């Protein structure tokens, strides 16, 4: 063994990724060459357009680039919506999915939606944001349309978590972001270390279990991070088809971030899926030397997470 691989970097804002260099470095085993230099092992892309279509053409180079062509698929609102609605063992099955409509500058399910919540005296609170973009919460289908129309965006609508699960003493809502690598075998590993931020700001599950335990009679396992399990899961599954690299000539990974909101009734929902998550900065380290381990040296071995 012993060898030398190369990799450029076109991703200077990335602290995920400018940390794995400096560990790439660190090996004494990688080398950083031009930004356009052609001759990588590995590309740490752009966050936006990267120029996929360049992979793998220079004869007995085996190239590995740290994001999935057609991850956006899940990592955009409105694609998010629709890869659920088709998908057959999905839409029926989201119980974890926010009741979510696309609208452009469809919208006709909705009000058939908005209505019978009307008509059955319920909670009928809903929420505007893009997809790629700046929100608004209000509770009238016209207060809310009439609203995309100017900002012109294609938005989605969402129905509002209402009763959210609290922490006190400071009595305050939250939402949890899970870090999960997929490589180039679509092995799914997620990170044991998740994070909670907080409103009016951050906290471990260390501490979070310490609250969902000294507070209640159930635990962090036992849960939510169940239910994070299987809506990840679920989600990767049904995008591989779209996104496996198995006859492309490259190969590829890539670090997600899932954003999770749980309600009183500690029912976990899937808020969005972050395809370039940044990190905590106690995780960096642990986290990017993690990415190394199981979806760099995996293909470049040197000299020498849970599984979903
Ligand atoms: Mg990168
Ligand atoms: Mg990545």
């Not at 200077?12 to 356009?36: C, H």
């Not at 699960?165 to 590993?189: A, M, T």
């Not at 907080?198 to 471990?204: A, D, K």
Request: charged share 25%; glycine share 6%; net charge neutral.
């Amino acid at each position: 063994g012993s060898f030398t691989y190369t990799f450029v970097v076109r991703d200077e804002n990335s602290t995920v990724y400018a940390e794995v260099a400096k560990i790439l470095l660190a090996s004494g085993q990688w080398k950083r060459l031009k930004r356009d230099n052609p001759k990588f092992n590995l590309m740490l892309g752009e966050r936006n357009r990267l120029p996929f279509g360049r992979l793998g053409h220079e004869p007995g180079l085996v190239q590995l680039v740290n994001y999935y062509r057609g991850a956006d698929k899940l990592c955009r609102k409105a694609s998010l919506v629709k890869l659920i609605k088709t998908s057959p063992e999905l839409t029926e099955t989201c119980t974890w999915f926010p009741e979510s409509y696309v609208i452009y500058p469809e919208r006709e399910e909705f009000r058939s939606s908005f209505n019978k919540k009307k008509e059955n005296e319920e909670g009928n609170v809903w929420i505007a944001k893009s997809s790629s973009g700046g929100i608004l919460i209000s509770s009238d289908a016209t207060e809310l349309l009439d609203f995309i129309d100017n900002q012109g965006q294609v938005h989605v609508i969402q129905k509002y978590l209402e009763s959210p699960l609290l922490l006190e003493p400071g009595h305050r809502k939250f939402d949890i972001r899970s870090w999960v690598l997929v490589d180039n075998q679509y092995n799914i590993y997620l990170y044991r270390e998740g994070v909670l931020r907080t409103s009016s700001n951050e906290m471990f599950f260390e501490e979070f279990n310490q609250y969902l335990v000294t507070s209640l009679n159930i635990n962090l396992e036992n849960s939510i991070l169940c239910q994070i399990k299987e809506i990840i899961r679920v989600c990767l599954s049904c995008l591989e088809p779209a996104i496996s690299t198995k006859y492309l000539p490259y190969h590829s990974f890539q670090l997600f971030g899932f954003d999770f909101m749980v309600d009183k009734n500690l029912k976990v929902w899937l808020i969005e899926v972050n395809g370039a998550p940044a990190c905590a900065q106690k995780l960096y380290a642990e986290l990017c030397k993690g990415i190394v381990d199981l979806a760099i040296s995996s293909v470049f071995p040197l000299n020498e997470f849970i599984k979903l």
